Design a protein around this ligand. Sequence first.
Ligand SMILES: CO[C@@H]1O[C@H](CO)[C@@H](O[C@@H]2O[C@H](CO)[C@@H](S[C@@H]3O[C@H](CO)[C@@H](O[C@@H]4O[C@H](CO)[C@@H](O)[C@H](O)[C@H]4O)[C@H](O)[C@H]3O)[C@H](O)[C@H]2O)[C@H](O)[C@H]1O
Ligand SMILES: CO[C@@H]1O[C@H](CO)[C@@H](O[C@@H]2O[C@H](CO)[C@@H](S[C@@H]3O[C@H](CO)[C@@H](O[C@@H]4O[C@H](CO)[C@@H](O)[C@H](O)[C@H]4O)[C@H](O)[C@H]3O)[C@H](O)[C@H]2O)[C@H](O)[C@H]1O
Ligand SMILES: [Ca+2]
Length: 629
Amino acid sequence: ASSPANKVYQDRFESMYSKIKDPANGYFSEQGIPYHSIETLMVEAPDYGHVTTSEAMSYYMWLEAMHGRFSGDFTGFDKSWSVTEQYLIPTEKDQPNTSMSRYDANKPATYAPEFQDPSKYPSPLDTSQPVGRDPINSQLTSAYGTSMLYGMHWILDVDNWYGFGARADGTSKPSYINTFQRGEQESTWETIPQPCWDEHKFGGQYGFLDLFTKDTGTPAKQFKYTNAPDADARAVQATYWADQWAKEQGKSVSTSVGKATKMGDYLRYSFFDKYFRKIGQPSQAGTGYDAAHYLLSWYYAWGGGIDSTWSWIIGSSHNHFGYQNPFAAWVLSTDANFKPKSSNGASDWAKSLDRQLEFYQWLQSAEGAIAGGATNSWNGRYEAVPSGTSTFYGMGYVENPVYADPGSNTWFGMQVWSMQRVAELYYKTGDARAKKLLDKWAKWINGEIKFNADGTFQIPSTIDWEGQPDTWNPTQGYTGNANLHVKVVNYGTDLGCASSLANTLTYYAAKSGDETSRQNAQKLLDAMWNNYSDSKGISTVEQRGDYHRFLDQEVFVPAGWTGKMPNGDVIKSGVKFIDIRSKYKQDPEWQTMVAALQAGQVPTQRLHRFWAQSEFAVANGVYAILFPD
Ligand SMILES: CO[C@@H]1O[C@H](CO)[C@@H](O[C@@H]2O[C@H](CO)[C@@H](S[C@@H]3O[C@H](CO)[C@@H](O[C@@H]4O[C@H](CO)[C@@H](O)[C@H](O)[C@H]4O)[C@H](O)[C@H]3O)[C@H](O)[C@H]2O)[C@H](O)[C@H]1O
Ligand SMILES: CO[C@@H]1O[C@H](CO)[C@@H](O[C@@H]2O[C@H](CO)[C@@H](S[C@@H]3O[C@H](CO)[C@@H](O[C@@H]4O[C@H](CO)[C@@H](O)[C@H](O)[C@H]4O)[C@H](O)[C@H]3O)[C@H](O)[C@H]2O)[C@H](O)[C@H]1O
Ligand SMILES: [Ca+2]
């Protein structure tokens, strides 16, 4: 039997679970896939409300696991895994083993430079630049008996809104698409949505391929997928709790545990430099593990030919603290039920745990907030690191890893999503490293939570940075980083971030006994329940300051390149964001948004983001379990 839980907060989880699963609320598609948000007019990471992400799927898993804990029914959790495997992990038809089996571990991919401006793309492939060796492929094919990769592609056009269909048929749903392709300055407003399976049926003469990379000959028909490591690691974290909670009740989610374990094994591809170059010596090709930074980088991607057999796989040189998950690393390296089948799976994850904790500590500012990250590829072209730039294992510090429009580390959300995992690790193991990080971080954030007399509240929203951490010396450890500072630019009432914050403070308070953290977590949960509830979960009105880009953001299209989106929209130099997504004018909220822009006002929206609703529900569940009385 599971220990008794606080009935007040358990009821709140149950109420939220009902609203999220209610068919009338519209959080899911007819195929059972959760959308990024109920509302369709939505641009922030994905550019349409009804596309889904692997992030949403991992929150769906977490939600169902918690529901299993209170209802004793885990069929919903097993269902979240079935939907994931069927729709987000490319099937045998989506990543043909005929092509994947032609992979060459000694030449994983062909080098191509990254540019700081989208106008420099397509990027030219250069076969003369060195590429290191992939040491884990043989481990995976041997353990699993296939060359296909088991990980989630990060974004999916659920209802085929863009019209690419499945494997170029234009009519099936869901539809594998990707967006970001052109570097740090390519915001969500500057992409050209493209299909993962490109047979040249849509777009230009060669589909959309030559908008991004340029080779010596004619582009081949090909498929390509991109993983979001933070989502796959969250899926493992969620499955661990589902396993623990099921066993406390004589139930089992054994089959889902096996899927999470296999996913964690392939997830190791994010531990490697993009083109397998040695960590700390970027001009040199790696010989295997010397190319592993052991952190959960921004992505690992793979692809291959559709009508001819060949394939490639790349890791990522860019690392952001917000993607790390020491808890998932702890589970995969120590729990016998989650031991990966591969020979080095568990030990690699053990190395990642130690490295991740060093990374967090190295990035901790004077105040306590965690700074951006580091890269093994300066400017995305393995350029020389400027003199005076701090390093972590030879990797140069970057304030906003991967994206600069807006900076990937200017959103407060990265703080809570990531530190929440450190709090779970601390709660379970009492790890001294996690303790030192949390004591300082929690003291910082507790001084930034503002409660108003009318029941509303505010927490940091946009943050900024000054300075850099001192160069990491593993034997010296944390120096205090006196010259690295966080600055809060503005506060807000992001319900998803506040929920993640309550979750982090709850785990931490439960282990440390810090009363200040416990009462702030409860006050946050209470304020949200009492003042922000609505018939669909919780919400508030927020300003969408970037929406002017719907109409004024020019999208770069190379000189001479012309094509068409499936609905007929012409792609050519001079198009704006809206010109290649004309179906958006049919959105119920379109006239309202345009009217605001016309009057010189900032459009506002009342949004129901799936992850935020689940975050709130899970946060109530966690509080109910850790503070029974
Ligand atoms: C943050 O988002 C991610 O950004 C990165 C930025 O780099 C994106 O990475 C890029 O992804 C592209 C696909 O989405 C690929 S294009 C692809 O590269 C392979 C490997 O080099 C090429 O394979 C070669 O093809 C030749 C035949 O055409 C063969 O002769 C040769 O042996 C093959 O290796 C393929 O042709 C290209 O089309 C970029 O390589 C990669 O940088 C990431 O996608 C975003 O999600
Ligand atoms: C007077 O001018 C206005 O000032 C206000 C001051 O509050 C500005 O409002 C603020 O705008 C910010 C940007 O629009 C948002 S932060 C925004 O939040 C969303 C939801 O949490 C984030 O999306 C998530 O991003 C993740 C990381 O990429 C994804 O993984 C996830 O799926 C997404 O949901 C997004 O990244 C953030 O940028 C403030 O909340 C708001 O107060 C206003 O803009 C000015 O006009
Ligand atoms: Ca830009």
